[PDB]
Amino acid sequence: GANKTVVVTTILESPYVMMKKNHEMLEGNERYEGYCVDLAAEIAKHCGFKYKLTIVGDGKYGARDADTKIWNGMVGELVYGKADIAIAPLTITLVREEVIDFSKPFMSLGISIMIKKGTPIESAEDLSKQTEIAYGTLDSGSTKEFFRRSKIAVFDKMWTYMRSAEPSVFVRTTAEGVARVRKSKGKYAYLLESTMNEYIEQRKPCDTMKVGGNLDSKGYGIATPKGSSLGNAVNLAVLKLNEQGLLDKLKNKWWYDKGECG
Amino acid sequence: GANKTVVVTTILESPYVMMKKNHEMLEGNERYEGYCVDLAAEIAKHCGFKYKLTIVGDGKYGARDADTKIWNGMVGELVYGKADIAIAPLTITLVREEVIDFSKPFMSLGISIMIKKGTPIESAEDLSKQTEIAYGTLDSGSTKEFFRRSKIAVFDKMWTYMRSAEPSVFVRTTAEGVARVRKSKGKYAYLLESTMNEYIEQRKPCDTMKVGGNLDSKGYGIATPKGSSLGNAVNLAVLKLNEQGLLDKLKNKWWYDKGECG
Ligand SMILES: N[C@H](Cc1nsnc1O)C(=O)O
Ligand SMILES: N[C@H](Cc1nsnc1O)C(=O)O
């Protein structure tokens, strides 16, 4: 049929998608700003379509509920036809690639450790060999899944501790993880993707630090329902943007150009 | 029909595919060793197929000849049905994705600068602002194409110089680029992918160094003829291997576990 407005599912995660300071006075797509808001614009331009940005209802990235077997988050929105595409920091994983399509990565990343400055921790091994400093991850997504599945000694040890720790060491959003690290006087370390970690490191009150090397290497991809016609065009659009140096500039724009820590 | 031996096209590039020291006494796939030889084995195991490794005839990665319009190298082998899959450090690019399929990346990289230790160069800008130290790239592939296409000031300036430099600053293979840097007393710098650069840095006589940050960010993908049935299984295989930490171990195995520079 004729062209139709493409429904984009995304998530409120700084600095990918954030509410403009004056969003209360705006409406539609203009309420949002950020790396993925800019990328969405570029993709639509190159693919030739108009779109409506919609924040995922449950605020989740996407996981298959072990109970109901129903996919939640942005992945779910695609799987059940609620949205036509996902433009956000959605990590490309095996379980997800089995149910939806992913474009080649538009950004790279790896699980990392975030500590309050001064915390005596330099690695995952360090965390696994102590109990005074608690640690956790987002309550769902590629990181939690990484630990739940891991057969690597150190990571499995970490998972055994995290899953049974009481009170919970898991958080609902990255913002909550960051807040916990900042208010825990170094007694809480947060495991999240290097990209968000690096961003937060340049935000006031500049009291957090990324320590150690990444535990893995992967990337974010633009997702579409399995078999979607839009998939191929989006993929080529992503590659073109990267080769034009456009993605690199968007990265600098939202991460370092306006860092608040010097 | 029934299963058939899968023809794998690859390229002799250390440490991805190298001739074993005693290859002269061996035959078939057993003549070769390296990261991609190991990856090929893992992919075949996970995808359930047997294969024959064959070194690309022209020794090229793959480019569309401006004259004949014919694709050469490994890309050509796929495009014309000479091979069923390419397992090598083949860079995922737009022009290539338009003619063949690529799995999600199995390794990340970026164009980098290789200098003989001591050379007064720390960046691409540095190179572009001087003439005493000549510089070049492989005579074909994603790096040369990066410069030929680039609209970025500094890189276009570099391309203008390189393309017209006499004698040629381009080389036929990475090995030739490395040799030129090592024998040029610092008067030649080589532009190649960070992965090969980092590998060479840990090889005797340990006289080369990677300097500056990468000029871009991209990845290597396993390639198959456009629409090939093998594509989907290979892609999932790649993701599974990465999530098992297998790719990380292969990287260490062939890059650092046996570095000869400490
Ligand atoms: N990219 C998210 C996971 C994530 N983002 S920041 N910290 C995390 O664990 C996913 O795709 O699940
Ligand atoms: N990966 C090659 C290019 C390359 N490899 S080492 N130095 C280079 O320029 C290609 O896919 O063309």
UniProtKB/Swiss-Prot annotation, chains A, B:
Segments on the Extracellular face: 120-262
Glycosylated position list: 3
Phosphoserine-modified residues are: 150, 184
Q: Which domain of life is it from?
A: Eukaryota
The subunit field of the Swiss-Prot or TrEMBL record says:
Homotetramer or heterotetramer of pore-forming glutamate receptor subunits. Tetramers may be formed by the dimerization of dimers. May interact with MPP4. Forms a ternary complex with GRIP1 and CSPG4. Interacts with ATAD1 in an ATP-dependent manner. ATAD1-catalyzed ATP hydrolysis disrupts binding to ATAD1 and to GRIP1 and leads to AMPAR complex disassembly. Interacts with GRIP2. Interacts with GRIP1. Interacts with NSF via its C-terminus. Interacts with CACNG2, PICK1 and GRIP2. Interacts with GRIA1 and SYNDIG1. Part of a complex containing GRIA2, NSF and NAPA and/or NAPB.
Its domain description in UniProt is: The M4 transmembrane segment mediates tetramerization and is required for cell surface expression.
Report what the protein is called. Glutamate receptor 2
Recorded name of the encoding gene: Gria2
Q: Which residues of the full protein are shown?
A: 413 to 795 of 883
